[PDB]
């Protein structure tokens, strides 16, 4: 939703891969 | 089910 | 203030620089008389008399 709103479900983990 | 609540 | 006094000084030297550049650009011109720039100070301000 809104970038700063409230949700009940945790945000998915963010990973930064070198190559895809 | 995605992020269902 | 002093700012404009010094700005007038800077403008005079640039003028003189332009005069010198014109003189140096016309070195090979036939029948050219060199230009010489002279400067004068403007009105003096009296604030309190002796």
């Amino acid at each position: 939703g809104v970038p700063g709103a409230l949700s009940n479900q945790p945000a998915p983990p963010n990973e930064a891969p070198i190559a895809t | 089910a995605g992020p269902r609540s | 203030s002093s700012l404009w006094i010094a700005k007038t000084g800077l403008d005079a030297q640039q003028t003189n620089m332009d005069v010198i550049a014109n003189n140096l650009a016309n070195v090979s011109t036939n029948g050219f008389k060199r230009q010489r720039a002279v400067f004068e100070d403007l009105l003096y301000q009296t604030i309190r008399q002796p």
Binding site: - | - | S1, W4, T8, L42, L43, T46, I47
Partner: protein, 133 residues
């Protein structure tokens, strides 16, 4: 006779506010070249007098009149500006910036002192009203 302090300090506050306003007007127009009539802006200053009618010992302070400051007009050599003199001497106001800044600071400090006087006087009047009770 603590009520007269109200008048004295109120007059002082008004006079210092007028002085600060005049100083700020001079400062904001230090770079002006033209007036509404085409005349160069002349630095102005207030005149402080004792606000005492004939027969009154000591009063507050009052602004008698606003007068043009006595100083030579600042001559600038710009005979390209549409406003100029016969020899291209643009006349700029004679504002002394340091003097105006110091005047603003002094007016603010005197103003605050008069406010303190008024505050403590009102506190004393309330007490006095609580004399016997």
């Amino acid at each position: 006779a603590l009520l007269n302090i109200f008048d004295i300090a109120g007059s002082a506050l008004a006079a210092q506010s007028k002085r600060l306003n005049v100083a700020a007007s001079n400062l904001a127009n230090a770079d002006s070249v033209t007036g509404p009539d085409g005349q160069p802006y002349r630095a102005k200053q207030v005149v402080f007098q004792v606000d005492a009618a004939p027969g009154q010992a000591t009063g507050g302070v009052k602004v008698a009149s606003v007068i043009e400051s006595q100083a030579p007009e600042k001559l600038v050599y710009e005979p390209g500006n549409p406003l100029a003199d016969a020899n291209g001497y643009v006349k700029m106001p004679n504002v002394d910036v340091v003097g105006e800044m110091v005047n603003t600071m002094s007016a603010s400090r005197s103003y605050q002192a008069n406010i303190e006087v008024l505050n403590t006087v009102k506190s004393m009047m309330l007490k006095t009203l609580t004399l016997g009770q």
